[PDB]
């Protein structure tokens, strides 16, 4: 039968900004996870609940594949129980997360001399995201009691900021592509390992 289209997530030419992270719903297909765990070298391949090696033996209703770019120092926030600007305001995993987090350095793709300004993250948000919440608002952030009325100014900040990746940045400041695989258990199971 039909193979799960993981290349169509991992090998995508373009990746999303973290604030507007993409989600691919994977369904009715067969997936080998041992190939991913050997298909490339990833700087991070951490699984929670499941086992990277002992993973092709299980069945699930749907698999979600979330992907985005963040800074190298921030990959540690893509884990249950973490905090920080990314975990709090951009992409939040639940405390009970079962799934895998895969990351690799994308300096050669996502950095540019003079700064790549296409990748953004949310800097200002009044409250933390719920798990798997996606906030794509560009409303001006009101940091005082005076309404902003769509105009930037004092206490009135555009909520997104650019990473500005340059290839000469320290590794902790280089762009990393991230894929989060989430395993749904609800209904006939439709994705299984061989």
């Amino acid at each position: 039968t039909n193979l799960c289209p993981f290349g169509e997530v991992f090998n995508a030419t373009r990746f999303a900004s973290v604030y507007a992270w993409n989600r691919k719903r994977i369904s009715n297909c067969v997936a080998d996870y041992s190939v991913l765990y050997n298909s490339a070298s990833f700087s991070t391949f951490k699984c929670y609940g499941v086992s990277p090696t002992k993973l092709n033996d299980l069945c699930f209703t749907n698999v979600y594949a979330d992907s985005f770019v963040i800074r190298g120092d921030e990959v540690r926030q893509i884990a249950p129980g973490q905090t920080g600007k990314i975990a709090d305001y951009n992409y939040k995993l639940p405390d009970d997360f079962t799934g895998c987090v895969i990351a690799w350095n994308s300096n050669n793709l996502d950095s540019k001399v003079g700064g790549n300004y296409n990748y953004l993250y949310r800097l200002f948000r009044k409250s933390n995201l719920k798990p798997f919440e996606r906030d794509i608002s560009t409303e001006i952030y009101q940091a005082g009691s005076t309404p902003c009325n769509g105009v930037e100014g004092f206490n009135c900040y555009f909520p997104l900021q650019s990473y500005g990746f340059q290839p000469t940045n320290g590794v902790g400041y280089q762009p990393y592509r991230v894929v989060v695989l989430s395993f749904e258990l609800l209904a006939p199971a439709t994705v299984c390992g061989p």
Partner: antibody
Amino acid sequence: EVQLVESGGGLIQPGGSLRLSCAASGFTVSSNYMSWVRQAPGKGLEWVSVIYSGGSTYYADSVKGRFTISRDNSKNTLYLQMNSLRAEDTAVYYCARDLYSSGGTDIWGQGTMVTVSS
Amino acid sequence: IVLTQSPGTLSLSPGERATLSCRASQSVSSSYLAWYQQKPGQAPRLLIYGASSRATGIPDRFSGSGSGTDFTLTISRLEPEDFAVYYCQQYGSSPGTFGQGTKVEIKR
């Protein structure tokens, strides 16, 4: 009329506790990144703690486990609880509002002196 | 990230140009850097954020530049009120850190 008015500094014995407070006007403390920055006599600025609008808090290693940053939205006030104080915590303590790449640390309190000594 | 300012003391006359350096131990986006002025007995005052954005009400003679590891604060024509200590700051980490300060003093 934007300002940060600090209170609570004074003399304290080593191992003692103090709480500093920072009453804000002209912006909403709970909506902002807020920081405590201290300066020992004759020395530079040491950023010791920060609190995020959503509640996350972070500390310099020099104060971890001893200092707690917090706030009260109804009083629009930032606090710093300092326990297990040591002589080297003697400094002027500033509170400040941080905007990072959207505007730097733009609002600063007037500073309050903490002296730790037996 | 350690910020190292140089020189420790800059000795100049009014009307001269001041060039203040901040070197980062780790190469970083320009958006993460800021510059502050502090006079004796006063709180620091923000001058520049994002390496080059002049803060509100700050005189035009103050300008910042740089990227990567090397950042510069320039005062194009020193005025008597500019003799003070200057601090650089990075906020790439939480909390960030400051440089150790550069003093600008009257030369005689």
